[model samples]
Target: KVFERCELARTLKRLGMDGYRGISLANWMCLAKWESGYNTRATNYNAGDRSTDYGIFQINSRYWCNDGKTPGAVNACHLSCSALLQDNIADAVACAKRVVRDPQGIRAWVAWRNRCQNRDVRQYVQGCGV
Candidate 1:
């Protein structure tokens, strides 16, 4: 997982996002630890919330995976689902790559986590190169 994320980060960096270094890689490790304990097959029920989110990123399968694949399959949103699907490391890495490539988007995601959740992800996610 680390290897793939680092590779993706490097790809983004090469595409002019020099700040990509290893920030996203670091953040993914932490997110995986908290989100699914690094379990590729993890799914969430969110007790009483009836939310049917799945995957390492804890993505909402319905909203995210809704239009992309076989009925009931979590969408990978990889732009090439045949090559990447839910529970597959490629899908997760692709999502991370998209976030890293977006300077303002990533910054906003970090801020949203810090403010609305009362949780500073940076506390555990270090070296956010950007």
Candidate 2:
């Protein structure tokens, strides 16, 4: 699903993701934008590593979801990769929460590591007032 920046912020806040596991709305929005541009249907394949990252949060098939074609996938979230590609983000949110709770926390997302961590993204929700 395509969400306006304000809508995404409201949804994230409503889902209790604003401060989930210590990840703030600014941080999460930065990660989501860098990762998927807020496109829920986004799917990225890394041919070099033969892995895929799925959905708005770009959960990796290598550890979180199963994409059948990816070998030895951990499927840690116990969900199908396709389940995340939809307007309703409940499942994606749940899976993301699980991922953040892992040893790396939000560092599970390389996008977060390179673009979001320690960066100021307060503008992502500027007039939304979430």
Candidate 3:
């Protein structure tokens, strides 16, 4: 499921991403836009680490979810990596929230630091009626 901008914004807000863990809605919106372009089934394999990133937030296999294949990986998010790819994003959102509970917080996402951090992300949510 590839969400339209405002639709994702509203849905994420409903999922409590607004100001979650001191990260604003725009930050989350920006993260999703860059990470997966709002596509639920988006995936990327990391051959260097033998792990993968999954879903809209691109939660990592090495540290977050169990794909049954990663080497010495920890399922810190406590769900199957497949759960992150669902069109129904309840599980994805749950795992995403758990991700930021780490000391790095939203910085846990490299894309966020490179693309969203210290940037004006209003364009992502400006017309979303959020």
Candidate 4:
């Protein structure tokens, strides 16, 4: 599902995403918007590592999920990467929490550094009532 911006914000809140490990709601929205534009089935296979990033958060197969591919992957999320592509987003969000459990926090996503960090992230949750 390609979630509307406000709808996605509310959904994330419902899933208990806000303030999980110090990541604010707007930060989460910004990450999702830039990573996959709120798309559920988004996928990007990296030619460099032969690892595919799946779903809205673009969780990488190399470390996050097990796809039975992606050489040397640890599958830290302990679930198939396919689960990230489902529209339900519950598993994807769960895995996302796992990603932040590391020391990097939101910096784990380089895109967040390039696109979200240090910018006016309020635009994401603006008017969303989140």
Candidate 5:
């Protein structure tokens, strides 16, 4: 499933994610845009390192969720990586909350570190009335 940017913004706000953990809703929206293009089924397998990133947030199999096919995965999120691919993003949001609590925070996402971080992302939720 894919969500319009404004739709996602509204959903995030409804989830109480607007200002969770000192991270802005717009910033999270920007990271989601860059991570999965708002596609819930998005999945990327990095054969170079044998790791997979799943879902709209692109939660990684390396340390977050277990893809089963990936050996020696730590699965800190305690769920299957495939669960992240579902249209209902509640699990993804829960896992993302865990990720943000880590030392790297949102920087755990390369897209966030390389693009969304330190950028003026307020425009991402500008018209959403969140």
Candidate 6:
């Protein structure tokens, strides 16, 4: 699908993301494809179709938008879209590398996150070693 390979290598390279740091791209794209087909225009339904979620990263309109301008641009929701367009694989890889470097790796992230739920990290990284 278009989402699977969207800007693939180029985007990843620009962000300094590479090698095992990108392992999660496949899984992320899988969810993204199902959620929005990589559509920057994707939205979601809520509470009996009475409400709507919006944007490429499925940002919530009500919570973030004010007449279509999101009230804040720094939240996790908005950051998701921002990461997609510019940071791309760099975003993912940076995050993975961060985890590997944090507490010196996944064990540290897990220690910090309190058991690790859906967070990103490098596999078998030298210092942290998953």
Alpha-carbon lDDT, every model: 0.46, 0.88, 0.94, 0.94, 0.89, 0.39
Runs off by more than 4 Å, candidate 5? none
Candidate 5 local lDDT, 2-101, one digit each (tens)? 9999999988888878777788899899999999999999999999889998999988898999877887879998999988999998888989988998
**Residue range with the least summed lDDT across 10 consecutive positions in model 3:** 121-130
| TM-score, candidate number 1 | 0.45
lDDT of 4 by residue, 42-91 (tens): 99989998999999999999999999978888899899998999999999
Structural similarity to truth (TM-score) of each candidate: 0.45, 0.95, 0.98, 0.98, 0.96, 0.36
RMSD of model 6 against the true structure: 9.4
Q: Please say which candidate is ahead in lDDT: 3 or 5.
A: 3
Better of 1 and 6 by TM-score: 1
Model 4 clash pairs? none
lDDT of 6: 0.39
Regions of model 4 farther than 4 Å from truth: none
lDDT of 3 by residue, 78-124 (tens): 99999999999999999999999889999998999999999999999
Q: How accurate is candidate 3 locally (lDDT)?
A: 0.94
Question: Which tens-of-lDDT digit does each residue in 1-130 have in candidate 2?
Answer: 8888899999989989988888888888888889899999999898987999899998889999988999877898999998989889999989999999988898887878898767678888889988
lDDT, residue 21, model 5: 79
Which lDDT value does model 4 have at 15?
Answer: 98
lDDT (C-alpha) at residue 118 in model 6: 60
Consecutive 10-residue window with the lowest summed lDDT within model 4 = 68-77
RMSD values for the candidates in order, in angstroms, are 6.9, 1.0, 0.6, 0.6, 0.9, 9.4
What is candidate 1's CA lDDT for residue 53? Answer: 47
